Amino acid sequence: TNPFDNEDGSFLVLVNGEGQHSLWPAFAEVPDGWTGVHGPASRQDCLGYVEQNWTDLRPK
Template identity: 60%
Template sequence: MMDDQHVNPFDDERHLFLALVNAAGQYSLWPAFREAPAGWRVVHGPDQRAACLAHIERVWLDLMPAAV
């Protein structure tokens, strides 16, 4: 079993997450304790990891990036 120091923050369901989107319409799951990277904006959360992933699956219907 892995200890807490080796858990990937993107997989650690004990934390809250954000759903982000960029100008090209691409979505990302992001830990809420980290600031969103430049060029990305929060569109859902903070919320549980599963809820953020469900939001992304609901709204990201076209996986092709938009022309920016």
């Protein structure tokens, strides 16, 4: 199973300088240029955070 699909995983939400959001497995080093803004939390919880808070896909 791909780690981004693991429903039993622990996850972060990250945001880059353009306001784009990414789910991220909490076990992995956070990539340069990305900041954790939510989690560690369940996969479903992180998806809810993104849907609520990322309202315009256009890069800032």
